[PDB]
Design a protein around this ligand. Structure first.
Ligand SMILES: [Cl-]
Ligand SMILES: [Cl-]
Lengths: 245, 245
């Protein structure tokens, strides 16, 4: 039986597009571009540092990815500027139905498992006023790996004392859905982009940037095990757990 | 002293864009798009499978990435179709000056180290007419990991008998430059896209999807150690090695 619902953070509970106005200031006219490449490179760097055996926490990864992104535009921001702007990732707006979802999921154990560094996750959760909606906010930092490395998911039992079989893992990120399934969790994927809409979008003449991010990041990955469940939004999870049991 | 020049394959010796006519002919109007996403997801899947501890060789990775790419367009081709089309990756055109470069390096040991599966690399090199240009063509497959995992680079000494100190590693891929440097090789990066040109392209108005790939894939990665040398072309390598040590 499901005893805990563990949430991915970035892209699942929190909207990574919401750094929009901060990036638009870093380079007027190019906010959309920066938003997308920043997120993409942030993910790539977490995978590559881990795979290379050169871990650095998500705060370093986030700043390195921002530096790369602004670099493509010909900028050369200093550490002070980078540390300042990267704070936008600790202010991400929660999806509008997150709070209600989490409230209805009580008394089940509720937690976050995220690539985010400890201080990042605490600030992000605090800013969103969701601190008391979680029994635990788990960072991969203790294991010095990033998802989808199995050690990241091993943390859930260590912290919550529930077995993988008793966990419903929730994520909008295909690679995270894959890593959680690989580890042994039941998984509910949050799919906000209908496949059919993307397909037609990619056929409608010139292809835009956000569309590029969407094509690369909003689908199930072909190498991964399929999620047990797919829902359109977080608010659907309470109903899923009920009609599930 | 440098005793061996070890080459990355995909993107360095061989042009991954040369699958264009095949992807386009296969699906009119969608070639450029497919070419970019195919390569991007091929890389992502090599990293994510390795990081999950769920290795499959590059041939499986190449076909999974193609299936994903065609899937974004709403296509669902069978395995037979995927295997046939994926053969395009075993026929990539070598860069025009690869043959001459390798020839002028004949005194030194010449090798390839690649994510490519054994049979993929043999065909790729043979079809390019470069089989007699290498003392060894090394696949990561034996280690059952993908770059930039250190075990990939460990293969060089195992096969050639030279220490990391005696190796000049050549690559156009930032993540691979980073992996080679972390492992201890001297590295010559091949940078075919000038930073200043990319910057201006990214602001030349509406950003094209092709520029998206360039922005994600053709620069040094900020988390990675800098390469020892950067040349604009393979043909500049012999001259670089002459006045090196
Ligand atoms: Cl993340
Ligand atoms: Cl590769």
């Amino acid at each position: 039986m499901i005893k805990a619902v563990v949430f991915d953070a970035y892209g699942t509970l929190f909207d990574v597009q919401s750094v929009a106005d901060a990036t638009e200031r870093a380079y007027p006219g190019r906010g959309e571009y920066i938003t997308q490449v920043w997120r993409q490179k942030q993910l790539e760097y977490s995978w590559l540092r881990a795979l290379m055996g050169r871990y650095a926490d998500f705060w370093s990864v986030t700043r390195e990815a921002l530096a790369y992104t602004l670099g493509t535009l010909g900028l050369e921001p200093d550490e002070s500027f980078l540390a300042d702007m990267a704070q936008a990732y600790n202010r991400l707006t929660p999806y509008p139905d997150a709070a209600q979802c989490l409230a209805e999921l009580a008394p089940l154990k509720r937690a976050i498992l995220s690539n985010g560094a400890p201080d990042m996750l605490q600030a992000l959760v605090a800013n969103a006023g969701l601190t008391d909606s979680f029994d635990a906010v788990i960072s991969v930092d203790a294991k010095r790996v990033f998802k989808p490395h199995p050690d990241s998911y091993a943390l859930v039992e260590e912290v919550l004392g529930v077995t993988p079989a008793e966990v419903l893992f929730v994520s909008s990120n295909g690679f995270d859905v894959g890593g959680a399934k690989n580890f042994g969790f039941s998984v509910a994927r949050v799919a906000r982009l209908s496949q059919e809409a993307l397909a037609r979008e990619l056929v409608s003449g010139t292809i835009a940037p956000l569309t590029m991010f969407k094509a690369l990041r909003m689908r199930e990955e072909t190498y991964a095990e399929a999620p047990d469940f797919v829902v359109p939004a977080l608010g659907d999870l309470p109903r899923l757990v009920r009609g599930m049991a």
